[PDB]
Enzyme design. Structure first.
Site, PDB file in Angstrom:
ATOM      1  N   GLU A  47       0.878  -1.108   0.053  1.00  0.00           N
ATOM      2  CA  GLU A  47      -0.084   0.131   0.119  1.00  0.00           C
ATOM      3  C   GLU A  47       0.801   1.280   0.151  1.00  0.00           C
ATOM      4  O   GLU A  47       0.398   2.285  -0.151  1.00  0.00           O
ATOM      5  CB  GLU A  47      -0.709   0.137   1.391  1.00  0.00           C
ATOM      6  CG  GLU A  47      -1.790  -1.116   1.505  1.00  0.00           C
ATOM      7  CD  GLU A  47      -2.943  -0.938   0.384  1.00  0.00           C
ATOM      8  OE1 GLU A  47      -2.959   0.233  -0.085  1.00  0.00           O
ATOM      9  OE2 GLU A  47      -3.837  -1.723   0.400  1.00  0.00           O
ATOM     10  N   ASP A  96      -6.577   6.776  -4.295  1.00  0.00           N
ATOM     11  CA  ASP A  96      -6.302   5.404  -4.543  1.00  0.00           C
ATOM     12  C   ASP A  96      -6.298   5.096  -6.055  1.00  0.00           C
ATOM     13  O   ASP A  96      -6.765   5.898  -6.670  1.00  0.00           O
ATOM     14  CB  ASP A  96      -6.914   4.554  -3.563  1.00  0.00           C
ATOM     15  CG  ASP A  96      -8.284   4.310  -3.855  1.00  0.00           C
ATOM     16  OD1 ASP A  96      -8.871   4.943  -4.739  1.00  0.00           O
ATOM     17  OD2 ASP A  96      -8.781   3.499  -3.012  1.00  0.00           O
TER      18      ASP A  96
END
Ligand SMILES: [Cl-]
Ligand SMILES: [Cl-]
Ligand SMILES: [Xe]
Ligand SMILES: [Xe]
EC number: 3.2.1.17
Length: 162
Positions: A11, A20
């Site tokens: 991540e 994102d």
């Protein structure tokens, strides 16, 4: 390796609000803030999760804290989910990490939909489980990451992450 090191690789770490892979506002290590397109909404939610006026930036520590709470929640969701708990429980340690990773990424409901791979993982049919799971929008959207998670389910080792 452990869940934290694993997700930290997948991540990354960002101290400023970013979007994102789906375009949503997120912060730190994959901490989703909102699915709203308003950066204002994003900032409010952030101030609320942090408990201070951040102005869209946090410290590393704050990020680490959010991440801890996020893993915890992920695990607890697994445990509370009648379709997930049994799988998880039948798994060895490396493989569980793979299961937490997906839940972290797509939510329990998202994972809970992999009906067939879940059953195959429960039967220890690794290769089969891996070929089933690649037939997903998850895999076609984030292929690099999906491959590392799937290899982990397939081998029960950390190779994909070295
Ligand atoms: Cl597909
Ligand atoms: Cl990816
Ligand atoms: Xe899965
Ligand atoms: Xe899988």
């Amino acid at each position: 390796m452990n869940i934290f090191e694993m997700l930290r690789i997948d991540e990354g770490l960002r101290l400023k609000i970013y979007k994102d892979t789906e375009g949503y506002y997120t912060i730190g290590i994959g901490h989703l803030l909102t699915k709203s397109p308003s950066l204002n909404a994003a900032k409010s939610e952030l101030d609320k999760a942090i408990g201070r006026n951040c102005n869209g930036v946090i410290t590393k520590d704050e990020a680490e804290k959010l991440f801890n709470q996020d893993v915890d929640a992920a695990v607890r969701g697994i445990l509370r989910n009648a379709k997930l708990k049994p799988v998880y429980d039948s798994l060895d340690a490396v493989r569980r990490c793979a299961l937490i990773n997906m839940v972290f990424q797509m939510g329990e409901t998202g994972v809970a939909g992999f009906t067939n791979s879940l059953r195959m993982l429960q039967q220890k049919r690794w290769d089969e489980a891996a070929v089933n799971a690649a037939k997903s929008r998850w895999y076609n959207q984030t292929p690099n990451r999906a491959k590392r998670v799937i290899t982990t389910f397939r081998t029960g080792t950390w190779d994909a992450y070295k």
